[PDB]
Design goal:
This is part of a larger assembly, with two copies of chain A. By secondary structure, the first copy, chain A, is an all-beta fold. Chain A contains no helices and two strands. Chain A has a two-stranded antiparallel sheet with strand order 1-2. Chain A starts with a strand and ends in an 18-residue tail after the last strand. In chain A, 0% of the residues are buried. The interface between A and B is small, with 5 and 6 residues. Bound molecules: 2-acetamido-2-deoxy-beta-D-glucopyranose. Chain A: It comes from Severe acute respiratory syndrome coronavirus 2. Chain A: This is Spike protein S1. Chain A: Glycans are attached at residue 35.
Chain lengths: 48, 49
Amino acid sequence: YFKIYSKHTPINLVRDLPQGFSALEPLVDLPIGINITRFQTLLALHRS
Amino acid sequence: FQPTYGVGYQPYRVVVLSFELLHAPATVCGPKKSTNLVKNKCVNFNFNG
Ligand SMILES: *[C@@H]1O[C@H](CO)[C@@H](O)[C@H](O)[C@H]1NC(C)=O
């Protein structure tokens, strides 16, 4: 089972993580059934 | 194939459904039937397992 929990929070702090409490709601459970040992973030470029 | 052929030579469309169970969570489930809801009585309830 792949559990994805997520939370959207409106913050106004410039640099670091804000200090507070926010419990993450369960968003989606995925029937993947696969081995995962490594991950990588995907970003987006800005072209001009 | 021709429409005037015998029944042993006429074209037959065949669909074979293959059902396998693997160690991954099974997601193609049947449509579980739902009994109408009855309130205010001592009943045996089965809600989502
Ligand atoms: C999952 O992958 C890791 C790293 O490749 C491996 O050591 C481990 O034995 C694998 N587990 C299964 C159940 O295949």
